[PDB]
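ZP: hey, is the gold ion complex queued? I don't see it on the tracker
AM: it wasn't, my bad. submitting now with these inputs:
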Amino acid sequence: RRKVQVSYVIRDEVEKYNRNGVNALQLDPALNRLFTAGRDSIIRIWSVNQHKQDPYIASMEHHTDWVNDIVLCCNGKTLISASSDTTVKVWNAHKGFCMSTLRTHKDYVKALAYAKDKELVASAGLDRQIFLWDVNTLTALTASNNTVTTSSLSGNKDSIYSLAMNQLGTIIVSGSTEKVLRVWDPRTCAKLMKLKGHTDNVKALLLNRDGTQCLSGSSDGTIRLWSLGQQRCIATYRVHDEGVWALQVNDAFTHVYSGGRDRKIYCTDLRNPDIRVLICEEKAPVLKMELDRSADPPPAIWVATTKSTVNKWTLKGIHNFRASGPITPLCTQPDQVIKGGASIIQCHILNDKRHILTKDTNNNVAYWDVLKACKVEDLGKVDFEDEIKKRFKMVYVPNWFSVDLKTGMLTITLDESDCFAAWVSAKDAGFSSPDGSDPKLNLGGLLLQALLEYWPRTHVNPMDKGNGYFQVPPHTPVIFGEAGGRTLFRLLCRDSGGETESMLLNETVPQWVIDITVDKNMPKFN
Ligand SMILES: [Au+]
Ligand SMILES: [Au+]
Ligand SMILES: [Au+]
Ligand SMILES: [Au+]
Ligand SMILES: [Au+]
Ligand SMILES: [Au+]
Ligand SMILES: [Au+]
């Protein structure tokens, strides 16, 4: 039995730019469209024509935690996504909307593998379980028939960080903290071999068309070539002076593109390792890369890092630089830059247990109101640690919420255990009521009431509006999730009115919330 937590995000109606690093990239050459999977929990669509003042197309927001991987199938018609919210989501990629949500995984969904030819896709995570999926079966799901037959892969002892399938979908390999790679036949689900060789966790896997050989990059700093025939590591290339997290290959399976912690991007000739071209040196560790496959040799490479900015680097002059060459990079500046937003990297809950001070990646300090789920002031580039001090309030209020910053935005979480703990005077809370004054308001209560304001159940029946003090921004996402893991339901505050929304709120809203919002049984103060 898992308890349920109500959480919300303090953000704007629209987040045009990534508010954290990008985990996964997916390029549509047909429509010149890029897909960025964000740690900000939002997938975004961009136009990569190169000549446009603003490349922003749309943003897909259903996920409640990091978006770890994305897969663009059916000639760019469908998008499958993997998230730390424990779910896999099917999206109409052309029109940009959510279609189905697979809640089969019990923990973070870390990677996706794709068999272009057989139109198959697999998902693995910290579950230690891999799930195979037919894309056509997924594309025809949500309605009256949400019937899902789960085809799993067994063996993984540890948490999965990488997945790869060959074009034909005859081979499937997993990478984990077990250091060892496990191979299977995706069509039969049968175990093939268990390849031993790596020293650390494998964050990047790559397979050739026929699935005869596999390329792997591990946190040990090496790229390893494997023969699935010979059933072992046929070669080892030490390319990076630290962890290697992202790999890409040409169609020949001869030139490998790599990046990871050391920020350097390299093309390395597997045939002649001597030939190793430094494409560029990024401003943050490389998390994922996506080659432009419009031409052979690939004309450009799209690069995702720890930063919010996404870049394209031209590979146009490699061959000419290869014949004619203190390590000088091919590129110094990116060909195309997709702009990024700021991430809140430091936060301080003030002594009143209502105000929050934050510092972001641009060094901008800002004051926030948790209870009214909003920003209050932008203090600018003030000294943050001095600001924390300046704003010392000599008061005590019990902790009634937790804070997370894994999206680069403020996410507040309420738990049954301490949601109602903070009892403050109305005059104190800045809620002057002249002159039938100073009642003792419960902060967590009022906040819950404001969050579920548009829920009709919280008005009247009878069983024979708001909280009365404030309103939360109506676009405020209200998330319902198991404390242990699984995210249950995400809706906007303003959407609680809708009949199908209210129907879902009725099944997910836990009792501890029903008591105060619906039953109006406000807690007792002593
Ligand atoms: Au398809
Ligand atoms: Au959905
Ligand atoms: Au080796
Ligand atoms: Au190359
Ligand atoms: Au090369
Ligand atoms: Au924080
Ligand atoms: Au904090």
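AM: back. Residues 114 and 121 are 5 Å apart (CA to CA).
ZP: great, adding it to the tracker
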